[PDB]
Design an enzyme around this catalytic site. Sequence first.
Site, short mmCIF file in Angstrom:
data_model
loop_
_atom_site.label_atom_id
_atom_site.label_comp_id
_atom_site.label_asym_id
_atom_site.label_seq_id
_atom_site.Cartn_x
_atom_site.Cartn_y
_atom_site.Cartn_z
N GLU B 58 45.83 41.77 33.85
CA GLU B 58 44.72 39.91 34.23
C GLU B 58 45.27 39.42 33.36
OE1 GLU B 58 41.22 40.99 35.33
OE2 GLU B 58 41.89 42.69 36.65
N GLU B 69 32.83 37.88 31.72
CA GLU B 69 33.22 38.88 33.32
C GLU B 69 32.77 39.90 32.43
OE1 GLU B 69 36.49 39.38 35.60
OE2 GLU B 69 34.89 38.95 37.25
#
Lengths: 81, 370
Positions: B58, B69
């Site tokens: 990612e 996150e």
Amino acid sequence: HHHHMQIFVKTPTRKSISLEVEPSDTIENVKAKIQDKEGIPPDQQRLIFAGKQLEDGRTLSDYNIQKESTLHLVLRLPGTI
Amino acid sequence: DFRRKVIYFRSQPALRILPGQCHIKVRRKNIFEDAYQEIMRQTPEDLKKRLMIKFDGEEGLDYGGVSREFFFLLSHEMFNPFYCLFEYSAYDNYTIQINPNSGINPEHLNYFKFIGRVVGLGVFHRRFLDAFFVGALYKMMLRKKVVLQDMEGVDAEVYNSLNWMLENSIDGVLDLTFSADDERFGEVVTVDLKPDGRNIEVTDGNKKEYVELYTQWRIVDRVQEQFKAFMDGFNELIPEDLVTVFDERELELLIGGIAEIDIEDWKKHTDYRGYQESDEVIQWFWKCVSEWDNEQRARLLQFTTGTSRIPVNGFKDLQGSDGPRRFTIEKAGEVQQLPKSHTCFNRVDLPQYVDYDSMKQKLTLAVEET
């Protein structure tokens, strides 16, 4: 040469799982029924009945687990396999 | 006073970001295991460097978002009761305490050290966690004493039993010794509360002592090794002499942040008993709450429910010891007394004060009382 039995598997998140099993099912068989219903891989699972951790190659009746007994499911710490 | 303390705290030498970078790489689907490996292989000096986090596969240029996150996902795995490191509080299903049977995983002490590091890391680097603890745990972090009242959030049913004992003759009613039952996965194991405890009968004469001994055993003794491991991890990033500048309610806000509370959601999901929404005192109550700031409202929430933590879908999902329990205001008590809370039921007992200023002041004293 096939007979049935309800047992319960209790999680620490307070959830109760109903399983239909046979007395001569292995502990491995039960973990794999848990994988069927809950998607949790057998190698992550510990099952415990009345204090004792249950070994994979033994049967429910080896541990004197009977109709409507409750087993406790606990998950291994990630990274310890 | 919280604001000044925070500034002061953040102004310390021990809290300066150290030169260089701390690199942490994890697979999203394996965040617990990967973060455990990444973080435990480093020294405390390493993790005080600038934090750089990347998920495998990612893109990570939005550092702040990736970071947020990371702490969000990780804290939900660390504190997932399945692993039996932590478990739910007694009066909800989203606030947590140390699970005394954590040892079922032989390696638990290291993972408690790891959690303490994750929580220390969040604080050190200004990243709030979804980590809301029972009151007794903040107190123990701060090396403050715990009392029977702290039991309510730990084991509410045991809390009620001890009170009933303190307020009622037990002689000829309860066969009791100076021992406790330590439950573990269907098994019951007996621990002495004092030397030769199981052989010493509890009476109306000595039951105060029994209660205090039980309270100390259940809350502090039974989780000692776990707690020490946790503080070891935590104090490796946040020195104890600095974090004790806060009290137990401030420590909660420091770790988990201060939520922006939707007042209308709250009003809409409030129950009234003996009052109606239209009643003057109920209107004064919401006047007082509206004019307060976010910290002041969070403190009202800590007072009423045990925590400032608001459930994901709002005040409709507020939980109590016996299941869902809406915020509730009841007409009870006399105008002499302070408002009184019941954290098992999210219920505030509010006597019908006849002017606004005495109400704001009664409620302020009640909330601020420790």
